[PDB]
Amino acid sequence: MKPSISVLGTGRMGSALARALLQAGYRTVVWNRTSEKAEPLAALGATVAPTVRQAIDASGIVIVNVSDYAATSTLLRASDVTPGLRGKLIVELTSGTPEGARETSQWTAAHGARYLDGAILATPDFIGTDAGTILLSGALEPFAANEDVFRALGGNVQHIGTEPGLANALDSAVLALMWGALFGGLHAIAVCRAEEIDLGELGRQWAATAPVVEGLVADLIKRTSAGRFVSDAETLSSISPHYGAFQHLKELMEARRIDRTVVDGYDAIFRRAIASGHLHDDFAALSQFMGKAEQ
Amino acid sequence: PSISVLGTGRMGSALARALLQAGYRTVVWNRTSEKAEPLAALGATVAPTVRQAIDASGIVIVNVSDYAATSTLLRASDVTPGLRGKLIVELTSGTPEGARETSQWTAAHGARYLDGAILATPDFIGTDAGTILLSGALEPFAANEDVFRALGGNVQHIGTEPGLANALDSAVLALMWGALFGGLHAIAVCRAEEIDLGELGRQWAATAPVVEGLVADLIKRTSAGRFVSDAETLSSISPHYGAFQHLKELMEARRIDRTVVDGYDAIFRRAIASGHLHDDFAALSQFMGKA
Ligand SMILES: NC(=O)c1ccc[n+]([C@@H]2O[C@H](COP(=O)([O-])OP(=O)(O)OC[C@H]3O[C@@H](n4cnc5c(N)ncnc54)[C@H](OP(=O)(O)O)[C@@H]3O)[C@@H](O)[C@H]2O)c1
Ligand SMILES: NC(=O)c1ccc[n+]([C@@H]2O[C@H](COP(=O)([O-])OP(=O)(O)OC[C@H]3O[C@@H](n4cnc5c(N)ncnc54)[C@H](OP(=O)(O)O)[C@@H]3O)[C@@H](O)[C@H]2O)c1
Ligand SMILES: [K+]
Ligand SMILES: [K+]
């Protein structure tokens, strides 16, 4: 076939989604409240639909990419547009909860629309590339039928199961890692700022040292999955040296008036693990001490 | 040159093996001497005391719990007289003031000093990727570049000022712990949403380069003062905060300790309270100071 495809939301992402569809030779129609933010996509060859309704019935698949499900829900569940959803495919690529996916599934189905709920595990620069990862959950047929449309967004766009909440559950897990790393960087930058270290140096040192962290994270997951909490020949780090080295960071942050709210959080997990006889056990032991302290 | 390693831990053992593999006469000491016996068979000499170890070799690499422990091994009246003409390489984790103090005391006993941060797990010592940052005097590094190359292909001298290594160590380890506590969270979520950790594993493999781009971008942008949104930003604060809500709610609901994420929240809210809701993620770097 080669359908017409609509994108609702011309944000930073969404704009990317749209450009990636234009670059693969799909007729792409775009709507955005604050329509001036959608003008750039006109020049790249998209048609700028004046309203949601015009957009959702100008195309046979509709990709949504706005703030949250609350905003999706006010665009698509309006009496204005709900009648037009018949036979269309809604692909909800906005960040949401698994209950949010299950609700949006049920109301789209109730208006004669097919539903795919998706988590974009990728920044704008990755949409269009063979590396671009988007996880989609929902019915299989509407995915299988349009594999060509999904390939235009990324080479690593995958269908992961029937149950439509699955994509967002996974999204929340992966985003937990992403924020850990990023708030790690925010700390790293605050330390460098305090000890008058050029961030260029931090940059070129992270380039070199990132693979070590990747090994460490991968190890955490492998070991936790296997219940290998006790120290053994294969562990690369025990809690003792982590906690020992960590002290030096706390003291530095205390001295330099850097917010400790986050690291005091780490401390509490360490101390919980050490309170059980885990001082000299693999870093993965910490995974058993993730629940709330008070009971 | 004969080379001594004090501390045959998990690391240190690695340091020792890497020296033996490059054909250095390596002597090793460890309290609880049975933990150093394995290195005998790979060709190390297990010195019964610290003193015998530090005057059996001309460079001494230290790798124990903390500077307090280094200081009780080397500043004992037993051994301090033997430190003359030696090079102490302190590769144990410590503070920058700790480096500056250990510099001054070693110099006062006629010893040369390099303070080092090992930015690598044991498996990376011996490999071209192995990264160790050394600060201290240049000559004692330059003179022994071959000894450092045996520990890693990415072993660097970064400045005269001897605290520099540990300052940088604390910054880099902040990133490392961010990621790892990120994983611990990611695992708690997976456990709650009945996701097999294998799935998390193979999804992080795929998705890690995205995070690497994001972290590298943070640093490049912060260094350049590019806090305001522009054509080149891949993420603004708004969508981060929006998606973050879904994580907080999940952890609240599943009785997962929120001490950490409430910490993130506070930084977001501080950035948003200034007109930075739709600015690059890097803007958050300006809201890292206390209350
Ligand atoms: N940025 C990334 O790298 C990335 C990656 C993965 C996931 N995501 C997800 O992708 C989505 C898009 O993020 P983004 O970076 O594109 O954000 P953004 O540039 O800040 O734009 C948000 C978009 O949502 C629209 N919107 C917001 N509130 C709305 C409302 N109440 N009613 C209608 N439309 C509304 C905006 O229209 P207006 O112009 O009128 O505000 C705009 O099109 C988010 O759900 C985010 O969680 C983003
Ligand atoms: N593991 C890593 O990947 C890694 C990363 C970078 C740097 N480091 C740093 O390297 C150092 C060692 O780490 P590790 O993994 O080897 O820790 P570890 O396996 O627990 O070993 C600690 C070593 O320090 C010795 N030690 C501790 N307190 C001592 C004292 N009071 N007197 C004498 N020796 C003492 C221990 O002696 P005993 O064995 O008899 O107890 C042992 O040899 C730490 O500063 C750590 O922060 C480690
Ligand atoms: K979604
Ligand atoms: K050190």
Author numbering:
A (entry chain A): 1 to 295
B (entry chain B): 3 to 293
What did the published study say regarding this structure?
IREDs are NAD(P)H-dependent oxidoreductases that catalyze the asymmetric reduction of prochiral imines, but in certain cases also enable the reductive amination of prochiral ketones through catalysis of both imine formation and subsequent reduction of the iminium ion intermediate. The enzyme designated IR77 by France and co-workers in a previous work has 100% sequence identity with NCBI accession sequence WP_053252429, annotated as an “NADP-binding domain” from the nitrogen-fixing bacterium Ensifer adhaerens, also known as a species of Sinorhizobium. The enzyme adopts the canonical fold now well established for IRED structures. Two monomers closely associate in a domain swapping arrangement that serves to form two active sites per dimer, each at the interface of one N-terminal domain with the C-terminal domain of its partner.
Crystals were obtained in the P21 space group and featured four molecules, representing two dimers, in the asymmetric unit. The substrate binding site is defined by the frequently observed aspartate residue D171, which protrudes from the roof of the cavity into the active site from the interdomain helix. Facing the nicotinamide ring of the cofactor, on the opposite side of the active site, are the side chains of M178, W179, and H242 from the partner monomer. At the back of the active site are V212 and L216 from the partner monomer and T123. Two features of the active site which could explain the activity of the wild-type IR77 with bulkier imines are the presence of T209 and P241 at the back and front of the binding site as viewed in Figure 4B, which replace much larger tryptophan and methionine residues in IREDs that lack the ability to react with bulkier substrates, such as AspRedAm,7 and wild-type IR-G36.12. The product 2-cyclohexylisoindoline 1h was modeled into the active site of IR77 using Autodock Vina.
